[PDB]
Design a protein around this ligand. Structure first.
Ligand SMILES: Cc1cc(=O)n(C)c2cc(N3C(=O)CC[C@H](NC(=O)OC(C)(C)C)[C@H]3c3ccccc3)ccc12
Length: 113
């Protein structure tokens, strides 16, 4: 509904397309993941990121990237390396940081001249 909201909704869509199972769609709770609220002090997921975009809570692309990387880092902390959760998190962390790279953002900035 503002330019930044629209750009971030775009990025979120593209990241969520890489999670066909919806592993990261909603907050992980203790009711599904024993010890999660002890092990993971700052949970994050795509649903919560969608809400923050909607609420225009991200001042910048940096802040949005921070939330994305927190989500992936938590998945890689709580879950063992042979799991679907860990693997996908590692994968989509690198895919998303390529998508939203400093170089790609600079080009986007020149185009907004
Ligand atoms: C144990 C566990 C750890 C973890 O890091 N993640 C991301 C999980 C995700 C889980 N989920 C799935 O395995 C299948 C999808 C499910 N998401 C989901 O159902 O989303 C909709 C409703 C959109 C289909 C996801 C999950 C995430 C959060 C709470 C419960 C299940 C279940 C357990 C964990």
């Amino acid at each position: 509904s503002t330019p930044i909201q629209q750009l971030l909704e775009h990025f979120l869509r593209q990241l969520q397309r890489k999670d066909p199972h919806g592993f990261f769609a909603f907050p992980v709770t203790d009711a599904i993941a024993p010890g999660y609220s002890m092990i993971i002090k700052h949970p994050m997921d795509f649903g919560t990121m969608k809400d923050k975009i909607v609420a225009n809570e991200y001042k910048s692309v940096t802040e949005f990237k921070a939330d994305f990387k927190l989500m992936c880092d938590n998945a890689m902390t709580y879950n063992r390396p042979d799991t679907v959760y860990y693997k996908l998190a590692k994968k989509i962390l690198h895919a998303g940081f390529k998508m939203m790279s400093k170089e790609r953002l600079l080009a986007l900035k020149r185009s907004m001249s």
